[PDB]
RNA sequence: ACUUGGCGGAAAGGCCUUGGGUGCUUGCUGGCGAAUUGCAAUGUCAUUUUGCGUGGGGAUAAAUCAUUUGUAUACGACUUAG
RNA sequence: GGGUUGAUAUGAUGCCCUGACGAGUAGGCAGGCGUGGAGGUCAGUGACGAAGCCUAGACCGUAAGGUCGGGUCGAACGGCC
RNA sequence: AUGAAGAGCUUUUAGUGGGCCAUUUUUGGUAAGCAGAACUGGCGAUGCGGGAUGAACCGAACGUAGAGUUAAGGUGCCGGA
RNA sequence: GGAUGCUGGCAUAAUGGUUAUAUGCCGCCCGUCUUGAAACACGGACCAAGGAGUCUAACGUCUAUGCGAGUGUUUGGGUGUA
RNA sequence: GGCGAGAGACCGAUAGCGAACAAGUACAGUGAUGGAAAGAUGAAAAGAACUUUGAAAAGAGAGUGAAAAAGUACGUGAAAUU
């Protein structure tokens, strides 16, 4: 027989060809596996994962966070790629020319960049524009700004957020909340 | 209507029936099998016979616990019994069968038995009273019966299939060579 | 007729029959694994039934097919069967149980003049 | 275990009828010198015979080559182990421990 | 419809087969085998009988004769897996055996309409057996009983042992 | 295949012998024939019983039921008689 | 783990190559078989016999199960998404 | 040095929460197929060959077949040798 | 970097399958709680038909979908082939 | 609930109201109360004239019917069991 050193059988615990049955997002799918497997680019790859990824794992990108990446050295006149959707942002004034090129705009977010003088851009005008990823900025967003990571983990001495529907007091500031009430925690 | 299994010549054969009788099941069922196959004339004899306790049926199926008698020596038994009641039942079916043989216009004598079935019918129900205040059933068990009575035919017939033959080259040329070697 | 197919081998040919369906009217043959905890049939004891696996599968090459080589493929129709009619190699048709004996009469037909095989060509015939 | 000193001879028929490669997380049969110095090239072996001589001559590199080489799936022995029962040490009058020169024997039958 | 369709129907044409590497090099007999040899036909019609051997023929066959004088053996072909070679050897350096081969034993295979209910020979095949077996004959006057050696038959009795037996 | 005379009783059922007839003889020398079962295909050859035939002789009963008995007996059985 | 959109032809969840591995109660997950009814399609089968029932008769599938033939019978019923 | 069969990270949820056997260490006890602990391995949850027979022992862990070689156990016969 | 060539016979129940039976070897009754069930532990005589983790309110993780600092038409109103 | 109307991704005679039928019926119990089972011939009775056996019931024929493999023990007619 064999002494296994391992588990037999396992699956590799990463998500390929997605469980969304959006067929235009599998023909991006063809697409860019095809590119993948050919144009020898990690930037491919990169955006074939992220293609694959859910819809929490695909968090969105505010126009504000694009003009701090922007804002950065070397990359103004870059091309920003976000494998998501793209959000409005009116805590911002300004706004630079340059364009992006993502799965979703939400209507405020395109105006926004129209207006600035930009273009909002699919992912398959980026592949026809940019094949290897030629000048490309990638963009992920906010994963653990999630609520239901505040409650992720919870036990004593971590300040995590238990799982409550009502808030106030009278609601969990008691016992286990103050050395009143015997202990804190 | 639509009677069992009977391989025979319908239009050399007579049958009878009755339905819904009150007698025993196991015991018409011992009668006909003691007159199965037989000569019919035979068969009415053996069972008046019967009726005058000269001659028995033997019991081979159902005979748990009944009493033997000499008699069956005759078949190859011990337990053998009187069944008055099957037997007058049967014989009135033979009579039914006979008149309408010799309407058909068969030679009756040499006639005989070809198909007889007994099987149960509808249980007729009436309760027993028992001892702690218990009710139990007292079930007749009745019974139809069907025969089938046929002129005896002579010898059946003969010439089987051709019995064709398939041969190797070499089966050929041995029959050949032992044609040619001998007359 | 046929298409160069490999040799057929099967791997079980006998019936994976219930165990107890020889036993018990109410068990029938119908395959249903034992999920006790004392069957010496789940435990795959010397001497017991050969329970069902995938070991058992057949050669792909060779699945689905009938001794002729063909794939059958039931047809209720000339239309049904003027799709089979590019496929006669690789391809049988099965006439449904459902069908008239008229119009199994004309699917004959029509097979015979496009080259076409048929299984059950046979059913509903006096003569 | 048994183990034991092997000689020339047997590793030379092990490797030429045996020899399989790890090859990115595959086991694939020799066969070629250009398999060989496609992966072990680096460390200036070309032949199944250069590598045999690190083995042997062991070398440098010696913990790549042993590393590229899959472990020798071997058969059991032809005409047996020699002893009735083995889980004795080969001085008892059994099977396993250092038979520092007689493994040369059991290898080229199992083999 | 009764079943709907398969979506994608596989290909009709036949793959052409590779090009095998199996050559075909001529038989390499064993070496108790020689022209002018005699034999022990094992097996077929004439089974158990002492014959000579004279040809290697293409289709791995041996020509093989009693003489027909003898024991009644034509010339024929055999198979040296169903023959024993004996020890013995009769010269035939003398014998024009370079005229026979395989169309010269040909069958003129039958056709299926022929079946039989139940049940000739050439002059040239006659003819040439004759010529052979009289020269045969004319050898076989040397060594004394050989003509009844072939004559009879051969046989296994109680007590014989092949692998203890030589032939 | 007949034929003479013996022997053998453990399960003999076989062993031996005499007379003559007939056939074969590979003890020796010879002549004729085989083929085609096609390169092998058990290549069919023995005895076990049963049946239907033809022809040759030979022999022309008992038992069971039923009956009766009671030295016996739950019935069967057993014993006796007609 | 890899290869392959290239034009003509079919299926990209496809096809193909290579290597390894396969024990299992409780239990988990997955892919499927089947039943009653629903929307759709087959311009589906059908009194020249639907369904149902019988069939040590046949065929497919590892299997759940499916199909076919013969018999019975008499009014409806199936394939696929 | 050897190996790495990928390394790390998170969420969530089932079942379980009666245990038993062997080696060795070991406590109570006259001792127990007793009771109670320790390390490891096993049975449970596991068929196979062997032990005549057996949950645990020895050997060996299981997809369907074929061929070869062995394990432990054996080679008068039952029974292969 | 995977077997081809030559020849023969059959072309049919011959091979093969199904099935019954025979033969050789193996084969304890299933379900269950159980450390442990063939148990001298429980349920089960047999057959058919029925027969057991569903629906809801409010929630957690996860995954799809829409919109996106907003989202939610559907209490209600308008309108309708209702 | 009562009266009257319409509908259903409902049940389809062991289901669905206990009740598709002479069902709150028969039936039980002092009584309060309890509380069933049971649908289908065939398009149409054309529901089997007449003969014969039998004490008769019934049978065998005949005949009706598309079909008695539809005969009021009636659509089909499984299994256990026979």
């Known amino acids: 027989g064999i002494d296994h050193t391992s588990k037999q059988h396992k699956r590799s615990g990463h998500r390929t060809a997605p469980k969304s049955d959006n067929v235009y997002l599998k023909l991006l799918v063809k697409l860019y596996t095809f590119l993948a497997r050919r144009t020898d680019a990690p930037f491919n790859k990169v955006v074939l994962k992220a293609l694959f990824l859910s819809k929490i794992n695909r968090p969105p990108v505010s126009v504000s966070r694009i003009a701090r990446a922007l804002k950065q050295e070397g990359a103004a006149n870059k091309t920003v790629v976000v494998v998501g959707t793209v959000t409005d942002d009116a805590r911002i004034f300004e706004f630079p020319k340059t364009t992006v090129a993502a799965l979703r705009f939400t209507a405020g977010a395109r105006a926004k960049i129209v207006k600035a003088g930009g273009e909002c851009i699919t992912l398959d005008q980026l592949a026809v524009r940019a094949p290897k990823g030629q000048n490309t900025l990638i963009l992920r967003g906010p994963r653990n700004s999630r609520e239901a990571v505040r409650h992720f983990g919870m036990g004593p001495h971590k300040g995590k957020a238990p799982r409550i529907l009502s808030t106030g007091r009278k609601f969990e500031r008691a016992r286990g909340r103050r050395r009143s009430k015997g202990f804190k925690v | 209507a639509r009677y069992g299994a009977t391989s025979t010549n319908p239009a050399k054969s007579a049958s009878a029936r009755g339905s819904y009788l009150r007698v025993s099941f196991k015991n018409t069922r011992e009668t006909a099998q003691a007159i199965n196959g037989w000569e019919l004339t035979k068969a009415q004899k053996y069972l008046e016979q019967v009726l005058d306790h000269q001659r028995a049926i033997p019991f081979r199926r159902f005979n748990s616990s009944i009493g033997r008698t000499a008699q069956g020596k005759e078949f190859g038994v011990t337990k053998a019994r009187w069944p008055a009641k099957s037997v007058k039942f049967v014989q009135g079916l033979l009579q039914n069968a006979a008149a309408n043989a010799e309407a058909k216009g068969l030679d009756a004598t040499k006639l005989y038995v070809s198909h007889i079935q007994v099987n149960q019918a509808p249980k007729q129900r009436r309760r027993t009273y028992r001892a702690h205040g218990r009710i139990n059933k007292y079930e007749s068990s009745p019974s139809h019966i069907e025969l089938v009575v046929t002129e005896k035919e002579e010898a059946v017939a003969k010439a089987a299939e051709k019995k064709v033959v398939r041969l190797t080259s070499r089966q050929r040329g041995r029959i050949a060579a032992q044609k040619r070697i001998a007359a | 007729a046929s298409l160069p197919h490999p040799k057929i081998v099967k791997k079980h040919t006998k019936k994976f029959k219930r165990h107890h369906s020889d036993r018990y009217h109410r068990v029938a043959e119908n395959w249903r694994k034992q999920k006790g905890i004392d069957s010496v049939v789940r435990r795959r004891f010397r001497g017991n039934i050969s329970q069902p696996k995938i070991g058992y599968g057949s050669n792909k090459k060779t699945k689905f097919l009938s001794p002729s080589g063909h794939k059958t493929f039931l047809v209720a129709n000339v239309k049904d069967l003027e799709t089979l009619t590019m496929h006669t190699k690789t391809y049988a048709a099965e006439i449904a149980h459902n069908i008239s004996a008229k119009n199994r009469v004309v699917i004959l037909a029509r097979a015979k003049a496009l080259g076409i095989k048929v299984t059950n060509p046979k059913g509903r015939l006096a003569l | 275990v048994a183990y034991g000193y092997p000689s020339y001879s047997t590793i030379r028929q092990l490797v030429y009828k045996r020899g399989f490669g790890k090859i990115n997380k595959q086991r694939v049969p020799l066969s070629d010198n250009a398999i060989i110095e496609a992966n072990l090239g680096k460390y200036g072996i070309l032949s199944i015979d250069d590598l045999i001589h690190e083995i042997i001559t062991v070398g440098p590199h010696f913990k790549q080559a042993n590393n590229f080489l899959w472990p020798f799936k071997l058969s059991n022995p032809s005409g047996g182990w020699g002893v009735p029962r083995k889980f004795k040490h080969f001085i008892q009058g059994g099977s396993f421990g250092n038979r520092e020169e007689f493994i040369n024997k059991l290898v080229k039958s199992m083999n | ?167």
């Open chain 5, 1 to 167: 419809t009764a079943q709907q369709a398969p979506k994608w129907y596989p290909s009709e044409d036949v793959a052409a087969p590779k090009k095998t590497r199996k050559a075909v090099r001529p038989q390499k007999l064993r070496a108790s085998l020689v022209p002018g040899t005699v034999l022990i036909l094992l097996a077929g019609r004439f089974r158990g009988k002492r014959v000579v051997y004279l040809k290697h023929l293409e289709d791995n066959t041996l020509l093989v004769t009693g003489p027909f004088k003898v024991n009644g053996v034509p010339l024929r072909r055999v198979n040296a897996r169903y023959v024993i070679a004996t020890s013995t050897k009769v010269s035939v350096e003398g014998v024009n055996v370079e005229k026979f081969n395989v169309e010269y034993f040909a069958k003129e295979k039958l056709t299926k309409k022929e079946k039989k209910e139940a049940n000739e020979i050439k002059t040239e095949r006659v003819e040439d057996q004759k010529v052979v077996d009289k020269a045969l004959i004319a050898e076989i006057k040397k060594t004394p009983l050989l003509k009844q050696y072939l004559s009879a038959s051969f046989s296994l009795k109680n007590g014989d042992k092949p692998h203890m037996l030589k032939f």
